[PDB]
Protein backbone atom coordinates (compact mmCIF):
# COMPACT_ATOMS: atom_id res chain seq x y z
CA UNK A 1 0.00 0.00 0.00
CA UNK A 2 3.21 2.14 0.61
CA UNK A 3 5.62 3.83 -2.27
CA UNK A 4 8.89 4.65 -2.14
CA UNK A 5 9.92 7.73 -4.14
CA UNK A 6 14.13 8.08 -4.66
CA UNK A 7 14.59 11.77 -6.09
CA UNK A 8 18.33 11.58 -6.68
CA UNK A 9 19.21 9.60 -3.63
CA UNK A 10 16.30 11.45 -1.38
CA UNK A 11 13.77 8.85 -0.67
CA UNK A 12 10.03 9.76 0.27
CA UNK A 13 7.91 7.29 1.08
CA UNK A 14 3.60 7.57 0.69
CA UNK A 15 0.60 5.82 0.06
CA UNK A 16 -0.83 4.76 -3.19
CA UNK A 17 -4.33 6.19 -2.52
CA UNK A 18 -2.27 9.54 -2.08
CA UNK A 19 -0.89 9.28 -5.48
CA UNK A 20 -3.99 7.55 -6.96
CA UNK A 21 -6.07 10.82 -5.93
CA UNK A 22 -4.72 12.78 -8.99
CA UNK A 23 -4.26 10.04 -11.55
CA UNK A 24 -3.70 12.40 -14.76
CA UNK A 25 -0.42 13.21 -13.54
CA UNK A 26 2.86 11.46 -13.65
CA UNK A 27 3.08 10.15 -10.11
CA UNK A 28 -0.66 9.08 -10.08
CA UNK A 29 -1.07 7.34 -13.48
CA UNK A 30 0.26 3.87 -13.30
CA UNK A 31 1.43 4.15 -16.96
CA UNK A 32 3.22 7.07 -16.35
CA UNK A 33 5.47 6.14 -13.45
CA UNK A 34 5.95 2.90 -14.85
CA UNK A 35 9.06 4.09 -17.06
CA UNK A 36 10.38 5.52 -13.49
CA UNK A 37 10.10 2.03 -11.34
CA UNK A 38 12.77 0.56 -10.43
CA UNK A 39 12.16 -3.48 -10.06
CA UNK A 40 16.12 -4.12 -8.67
CA UNK A 41 14.93 -1.80 -5.91
CA UNK A 42 11.12 -2.07 -5.82
CA UNK A 43 10.79 1.83 -5.83
CA UNK A 44 10.43 4.72 -8.53
CA UNK A 45 13.92 7.04 -9.02
CA UNK A 46 14.01 9.95 -10.40
CA UNK A 47 17.23 11.77 -11.41
CA UNK A 48 15.99 15.58 -10.64
CA UNK A 49 15.99 18.49 -8.26
CA UNK A 50 15.74 17.43 -4.41
CA UNK A 51 14.51 20.30 -2.57
CA UNK A 52 11.63 20.78 -5.10
CA UNK A 53 10.16 17.51 -4.59
CA UNK A 54 8.81 18.04 -0.57
CA UNK A 55 6.66 20.66 -2.58
CA UNK A 56 5.76 18.04 -5.65
CA UNK A 57 4.39 15.30 -2.91
CA UNK A 58 3.11 18.00 -0.29
CA UNK A 59 0.49 18.98 -3.01
CA UNK A 60 -0.88 15.31 -3.23
CA UNK A 61 -0.94 14.96 1.10
CA UNK A 62 -3.07 17.76 1.13
CA UNK A 63 -5.12 17.01 -1.53
CA UNK A 64 -4.44 20.07 -3.61
CA UNK A 65 -2.67 22.31 -2.25
CA UNK A 66 0.66 23.26 -4.94
CA UNK A 67 3.29 25.80 -2.89
CA UNK A 68 6.39 26.42 -4.20
CA UNK A 69 8.86 26.10 -1.62
CA UNK A 70 10.69 30.02 -0.68
CA UNK A 71 14.16 27.79 -1.60
CA UNK A 72 13.42 27.25 -4.87
CA UNK A 73 13.34 29.46 -7.24
CA UNK A 74 10.05 29.87 -9.51
CA UNK A 75 11.65 28.66 -13.17
CA UNK A 76 12.94 25.58 -11.71
CA UNK A 77 9.90 24.78 -9.77
CA UNK A 78 7.79 25.47 -12.70
CA UNK A 79 9.84 22.96 -14.79
CA UNK A 80 9.38 20.52 -12.05
CA UNK A 81 5.39 20.90 -12.29
CA UNK A 82 5.60 20.35 -15.41
CA UNK A 83 7.62 17.39 -15.45
CA UNK A 84 5.36 15.85 -12.77
CA UNK A 85 2.38 17.09 -14.98
CA UNK A 86 0.28 18.18 -12.15
CA UNK A 87 -1.09 21.10 -14.45
CA UNK B 1 13.97 4.38 25.26
CA UNK B 2 14.63 5.63 21.59
CA UNK B 3 11.29 6.82 19.72
CA UNK B 4 11.67 6.43 15.34
CA UNK B 5 9.02 8.87 14.02
CA UNK B 6 9.10 8.04 9.74
CA UNK B 7 7.31 11.56 8.25
CA UNK B 8 7.13 10.21 4.29
CA UNK B 9 10.00 8.92 4.48
CA UNK B 10 12.19 11.12 6.39
CA UNK B 11 13.74 9.58 9.56
CA UNK B 12 13.39 11.40 13.06
CA UNK B 13 14.51 9.87 16.33
CA UNK B 14 14.10 11.01 20.04
CA UNK B 15 14.19 9.81 23.36
CA UNK B 16 10.62 8.30 25.02
CA UNK B 17 10.97 11.12 27.74
CA UNK B 18 11.35 14.10 25.00
CA UNK B 19 7.61 13.55 23.85
CA UNK B 20 6.20 12.65 27.12
CA UNK B 21 6.69 15.95 28.40
CA UNK B 22 3.52 17.13 26.57
CA UNK B 23 1.27 14.38 27.36
CA UNK B 24 -1.74 15.88 25.88
CA UNK B 25 -0.58 15.80 22.46
CA UNK B 26 -0.74 13.43 19.63
CA UNK B 27 2.98 12.86 20.23
CA UNK B 28 2.83 13.09 23.49
CA UNK B 29 -0.23 10.46 23.83
CA UNK B 30 0.73 6.80 23.76
CA UNK B 31 -2.70 5.94 22.63
CA UNK B 32 -3.06 8.29 20.38
CA UNK B 33 0.72 7.90 18.73
CA UNK B 34 0.13 4.22 18.75
CA UNK B 35 -2.31 4.21 15.72
CA UNK B 36 0.40 5.49 13.44
CA UNK B 37 2.38 2.63 14.98
CA UNK B 38 4.29 0.06 12.50
CA UNK B 39 5.35 -2.91 14.54
CA UNK B 40 7.07 -4.92 11.53
CA UNK B 41 9.40 -1.14 10.99
CA UNK B 42 9.64 0.05 14.95
CA UNK B 43 9.01 3.34 14.17
CA UNK B 44 5.44 5.31 13.54
CA UNK B 45 4.63 6.82 9.81
CA UNK B 46 2.89 9.63 9.14
CA UNK B 47 2.41 10.79 5.33
CA UNK B 48 2.54 13.78 5.92
CA UNK B 49 4.99 17.37 5.27
CA UNK B 50 8.10 17.13 6.26
CA UNK B 51 10.03 20.46 6.80
CA UNK B 52 7.26 21.11 9.02
CA UNK B 53 8.44 18.60 11.21
CA UNK B 54 11.72 19.65 12.42
CA UNK B 55 9.38 22.97 14.48
CA UNK B 56 7.29 19.89 15.62
CA UNK B 57 9.88 17.98 17.08
CA UNK B 58 11.56 21.31 18.51
CA UNK B 59 8.72 22.57 20.35
CA UNK B 60 9.58 19.07 22.55
CA UNK B 61 12.80 19.09 22.57
CA UNK B 62 12.43 22.70 23.67
CA UNK B 63 10.23 22.50 26.31
CA UNK B 64 7.56 24.08 24.71
CA UNK B 65 9.55 26.71 22.24
CA UNK B 66 7.22 26.58 18.58
CA UNK B 67 8.61 28.26 15.93
CA UNK B 68 7.50 28.05 12.61
CA UNK B 69 10.23 27.42 9.71
CA UNK B 70 10.26 30.23 7.64
CA UNK B 71 10.50 27.93 4.79
CA UNK B 72 7.20 26.63 5.37
CA UNK B 73 3.88 29.11 5.32
CA UNK B 74 2.01 30.10 7.83
CA UNK B 75 -1.46 28.24 6.83
CA UNK B 76 0.52 25.08 6.45
CA UNK B 77 1.83 25.26 9.32
CA UNK B 78 -0.78 26.17 11.35
CA UNK B 79 -2.54 22.71 9.84
CA UNK B 80 -0.17 20.13 11.09
CA UNK B 81 -0.20 22.55 14.46
CA UNK B 82 -3.79 21.45 14.65
CA UNK B 83 -3.01 17.89 13.74
CA UNK B 84 -0.35 17.35 16.08
CA UNK B 85 -2.56 18.89 18.78
CA UNK B 86 -0.32 21.30 19.88
CA UNK B 87 -2.33 23.50 21.09
CA UNK C 1 38.62 7.22 10.91
CA UNK C 2 34.92 8.51 10.47
CA UNK C 3 32.59 8.96 13.27
CA UNK C 4 29.04 9.31 12.52
CA UNK C 5 26.92 11.88 14.49
CA UNK C 6 23.05 11.24 14.68
CA UNK C 7 20.78 14.41 15.29
CA UNK C 8 17.57 13.56 16.35
CA UNK C 9 17.92 11.03 13.27
CA UNK C 10 19.66 12.89 10.90
CA UNK C 11 23.41 11.42 10.19
CA UNK C 12 26.27 13.41 9.69
CA UNK C 13 29.69 11.62 8.83
CA UNK C 14 33.35 13.21 9.17
CA UNK C 15 36.44 12.28 9.94
CA UNK C 16 38.41 12.55 13.37
CA UNK C 17 40.80 14.84 12.41
CA UNK C 18 38.08 17.52 11.07
CA UNK C 19 36.66 17.32 14.80
CA UNK C 20 39.89 17.44 16.44
CA UNK C 21 40.32 21.01 14.63
CA UNK C 22 38.96 22.04 17.55
CA UNK C 23 40.00 20.27 20.88
CA UNK C 24 38.08 22.62 23.56
CA UNK C 25 34.70 22.18 22.11
CA UNK C 26 32.35 19.35 23.04
CA UNK C 27 32.69 16.93 20.31
CA UNK C 28 36.52 17.97 19.10
CA UNK C 29 37.52 16.63 22.84
CA UNK C 30 36.92 12.54 23.21
CA UNK C 31 35.86 13.09 27.29
CA UNK C 32 32.87 15.48 26.44
CA UNK C 33 31.31 13.96 23.02
CA UNK C 34 32.05 10.24 25.08
CA UNK C 35 28.87 11.09 26.99
CA UNK C 36 26.64 10.89 23.43
CA UNK C 37 28.11 7.49 22.31
CA UNK C 38 25.43 5.24 21.57
CA UNK C 39 27.29 1.47 21.85
CA UNK C 40 23.87 -0.41 20.17
CA UNK C 41 24.97 1.94 17.32
CA UNK C 42 28.30 3.31 17.02
CA UNK C 43 27.59 6.69 16.25
CA UNK C 44 26.99 9.89 18.58
CA UNK C 45 23.51 10.67 19.40
CA UNK C 46 22.33 13.90 20.42
CA UNK C 47 18.64 15.09 20.66
CA UNK C 48 18.76 18.20 19.33
CA UNK C 49 17.51 20.71 16.52
CA UNK C 50 18.54 19.36 13.11
CA UNK C 51 18.69 22.42 10.32
CA UNK C 52 21.22 23.96 13.15
CA UNK C 53 24.09 21.09 12.62
CA UNK C 54 24.91 21.61 9.08
CA UNK C 55 26.53 24.67 9.90
CA UNK C 56 28.20 23.72 13.05
CA UNK C 57 29.80 20.53 11.24
CA UNK C 58 30.75 23.23 8.64
CA UNK C 59 32.30 25.25 11.20
CA UNK C 60 35.25 22.35 11.52
CA UNK C 61 35.56 21.28 8.07
CA UNK C 62 36.26 25.13 7.21
CA UNK C 63 38.56 25.50 9.71
CA UNK C 64 36.85 27.65 11.65
CA UNK C 65 33.79 29.77 10.08
CA UNK C 66 30.64 30.04 12.07
CA UNK C 67 27.89 30.73 9.81
CA UNK C 68 24.07 30.96 11.00
CA UNK C 69 21.27 29.65 8.76
CA UNK C 70 19.56 31.55 7.54
CA UNK C 71 16.59 29.42 8.03
CA UNK C 72 17.09 28.88 11.82
CA UNK C 73 16.41 31.49 14.61
CA UNK C 74 19.40 33.77 15.58
CA UNK C 75 18.18 32.93 19.72
CA UNK C 76 17.51 28.91 19.18
CA UNK C 77 21.30 29.10 17.12
CA UNK C 78 22.67 30.42 19.86
CA UNK C 79 21.54 27.88 22.20
CA UNK C 80 23.10 25.49 19.97
CA UNK C 81 26.57 27.14 19.78
CA UNK C 82 26.77 27.05 23.47
CA UNK C 83 25.00 23.21 23.66
CA UNK C 84 28.30 22.29 21.42
CA UNK C 85 30.74 24.59 23.12
CA UNK C 86 32.16 26.76 20.20
CA UNK C 87 32.60 30.11 21.90
CA UNK D 1 24.86 3.35 -14.11
CA UNK D 2 24.34 4.30 -10.98
CA UNK D 3 26.99 6.70 -8.56
CA UNK D 4 26.28 7.08 -4.85
CA UNK D 5 28.00 10.56 -3.42
CA UNK D 6 27.91 10.70 0.33
CA UNK D 7 28.32 14.43 1.31
CA UNK D 8 28.93 14.16 5.16
CA UNK D 9 26.55 11.39 5.49
CA UNK D 10 24.17 12.63 3.21
CA UNK D 11 23.79 10.01 0.35
CA UNK D 12 22.96 11.88 -3.07
CA UNK D 13 22.45 9.22 -6.48
CA UNK D 14 22.51 10.29 -9.59
CA UNK D 15 22.97 8.59 -13.15
CA UNK D 16 26.98 8.59 -14.35
CA UNK D 17 25.67 10.31 -17.68
CA UNK D 18 24.37 12.88 -15.68
CA UNK D 19 28.13 14.13 -14.10
CA UNK D 20 29.75 12.65 -17.67
CA UNK D 21 28.45 16.22 -19.53
CA UNK D 22 30.81 18.36 -17.91
CA UNK D 23 33.85 16.23 -17.67
CA UNK D 24 36.39 18.91 -17.08
CA UNK D 25 34.77 19.02 -13.87
CA UNK D 26 35.78 16.88 -10.30
CA UNK D 27 32.64 15.16 -10.61
CA UNK D 28 32.86 14.65 -14.27
CA UNK D 29 36.34 13.51 -14.45
CA UNK D 30 37.01 9.84 -13.26
CA UNK D 31 40.34 10.22 -12.64
CA UNK D 32 39.51 13.45 -10.37
CA UNK D 33 37.01 12.11 -8.40
CA UNK D 34 38.87 9.02 -7.85
CA UNK D 35 40.71 10.25 -5.19
CA UNK D 36 37.14 10.65 -3.08
CA UNK D 37 36.01 6.78 -4.20
CA UNK D 38 35.66 4.49 -1.24
CA UNK D 39 36.02 0.98 -2.65
CA UNK D 40 34.32 -0.28 0.31
CA UNK D 41 30.66 1.00 0.17
CA UNK D 42 31.17 1.79 -3.75
CA UNK D 43 30.55 5.48 -3.26
CA UNK D 44 32.63 8.92 -3.50
CA UNK D 45 33.17 10.56 -0.20
CA UNK D 46 33.25 14.33 0.74
CA UNK D 47 33.77 15.76 4.25
CA UNK D 48 32.00 18.96 2.94
CA UNK D 49 29.13 21.66 3.06
CA UNK D 50 25.91 19.41 2.80
CA UNK D 51 23.37 22.34 1.74
CA UNK D 52 25.38 23.42 -1.06
CA UNK D 53 25.29 20.25 -2.97
CA UNK D 54 21.92 20.43 -4.29
CA UNK D 55 23.22 22.90 -6.30
CA UNK D 56 26.21 21.51 -7.61
CA UNK D 57 23.91 18.34 -8.18
CA UNK D 58 21.01 20.25 -9.69
CA UNK D 59 23.95 22.20 -11.62
CA UNK D 60 24.62 18.74 -13.94
CA UNK D 61 21.05 17.77 -14.14
CA UNK D 62 20.17 20.87 -15.36
CA UNK D 63 22.50 20.94 -18.41
CA UNK D 64 24.31 23.89 -16.93
CA UNK D 65 22.03 25.66 -14.69
CA UNK D 66 24.05 27.35 -11.82
CA UNK D 67 21.94 28.67 -8.99
CA UNK D 68 23.03 29.41 -5.44
CA UNK D 69 20.50 28.18 -3.13
CA UNK D 70 19.46 31.01 -0.94
CA UNK D 71 19.98 29.31 2.41
CA UNK D 72 23.85 29.19 1.65
CA UNK D 73 26.01 32.23 1.87
CA UNK D 74 27.91 33.64 -1.53
CA UNK D 75 31.21 33.30 -0.22
CA UNK D 76 31.09 29.42 0.88
CA UNK D 77 29.16 28.43 -2.52
CA UNK D 78 31.65 30.19 -4.65
CA UNK D 79 33.98 28.21 -2.59
CA UNK D 80 31.97 24.82 -3.03
CA UNK D 81 31.82 26.07 -6.69
CA UNK D 82 35.71 26.18 -6.66
CA UNK D 83 36.18 22.68 -5.57
CA UNK D 84 33.86 21.39 -7.46
CA UNK D 85 35.45 22.94 -10.34
CA UNK D 86 32.31 23.49 -12.44
CA UNK D 87 33.71 26.97 -13.32
Same mark, same amino acid.
Request: aromatic share 36%; charged share 10%.
Given at each position: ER???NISGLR $???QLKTL?? $?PE? %? %?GDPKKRMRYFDPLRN????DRNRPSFDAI %???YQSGGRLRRPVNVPLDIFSEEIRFYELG
Open positions: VVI $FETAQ $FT %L %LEYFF %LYY
